[model samples]
Target: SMSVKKPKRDDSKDLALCSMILTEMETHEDAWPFLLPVNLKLVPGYKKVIKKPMDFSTIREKLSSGQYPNLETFALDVRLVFDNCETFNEDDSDIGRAGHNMRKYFEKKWTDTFK
Candidate 1:
């Protein structure tokens, strides 16, 4: 008689894992250029941020060194980017819900960690 192998993890867990993996893949390498315009609107000085340096290393240095005058503005832009990346082009209902959820999460984390 052949031994039966365990059927692996639960299907939902597998699906969740797969979805996360796909989301990660989708986030790579300029996958969503449409997001740029909205992001530019959300964060102040976005153009300046990207324009200051021609390469990633210099950009990272500028960010780490706090050279940018508008850190809060940058923060907002980053938050908006992450929050709106998936639902940016979706219906207003979806975008509104996601934006609300993201703002709540940001407030909670920011208050606990930085306050």
Candidate 2:
């Protein structure tokens, strides 16, 4: 009898791509709203509706602090930023439109970079 499983593959390349993508996101025009975590005091209802909040700054911090182990995890967090936006705001709303644009930008980069 034998039981063995190899460890997960290295994610150095994934990290590189994540960092590159994050840099682009940080510079995008629509990045202002999503730059930092949503201010609960300003929008007190945010926490009550959106359970988990995600933003560019938090993503950057997680990346730099080695919290993202691979692209999958990184991608999920990135998507969450936009998903929350859509859930909280209407498509025609100011922030809603920005979220749409940013999500489009990210998906385009993600596809071109990986697929």
Candidate 3:
């Protein structure tokens, strides 16, 4: 048999805002000389989210459309994904650490960062 774990409620806010921030990045794959990385699948099953937009794309899509991404719904997406995921973390893997950096990047900036 196996066990299960979950991400705390607070993580959603981070993930939601994180998901929104990621859209601005054309792609780590899009990243070239200066910033070369974008493993979107650091969470292991991230591709599933892209393939199964019904589970998460709604929030990212709203932000792209210039609408406020509902934080509540965004959290819902985090929980759904977390519930299904097993591995998470940034520092000790060959995987890109965008999850950690994106949050930190936005936290230090203000109105100017967005523009």
lDDT of 2 by residue, 1-115 (tens): 2577687666558888889999999999999989999998899789899999999999999999999877889999999999999999999988989999999999999999877
Q: List the residue pairs that clash in candidate 2.
A: none
User: Superposing every Cα of model 2 onto the true structure, what RMSD results?
Assistant: 2.6
Stretches of model 2 off by over 4 angstroms after superposition: 1-11
- The digit string of per-residue lDDT tens for model 3 on 6-34 reads 75455335444555454543243422211
Model 1's number of clashes is 0
lDDT of 1 by residue, 57-97 (tens): 33234455656454354345445444444433343555555
On a 0 to 1 TM-score scale, where does candidate 3 land against the true structure?
0.30
RMSD vs true structure, all candidates: 16.0, 2.6, 12.4
Ranking of all predicted structures according to TM-score, beginning with the best and ending with the worst: 2, 1, 3
All candidates' lDDT scores? 0.42, 0.92, 0.40
Per-candidate TM-score against the hidden true structure: 0.32, 0.89, 0.30
